[PDB]
Amino acid sequence: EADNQIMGPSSYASFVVRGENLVTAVSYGRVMRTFEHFMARIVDSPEKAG
């Protein structure tokens, strides 16, 4: 065998419906994942290419 062990993530990641996502939930029923990424993509410099 090449390696005996592998390094892995110790804990789960956290998806919590925070404040800015919750307003979409109660109103439209469509919460989204990583809303702050959407704000940074189409509000804070949308002309910056991905």
Across 36-48, b (16+ Cβ under 10 Å) vs e yields: eeeeeeeeeeeee
Residues 2-21 that bind a copy of itself (CB under 8 A): 19-20
Rule CB under 8 A: is residue 26 a binding residue for a copy of itself? yes
To the nearest whole angstrom, how small is the minimum distance from the Cβ of residue 31 to a copy of itself?
10
Rule CB under 8 A: is residue 22 a binding residue for a copy of itself? yes
CA 42 to chain centre: 15
* Residues 16 and 25 sit within 8 Å (Cβ to Cβ): no
Q: Give the binding site for a copy of itself (CB under 8 A).
A: 19-20, 22-24, 26-28, 30, 32, 35, 38-39, 42-44
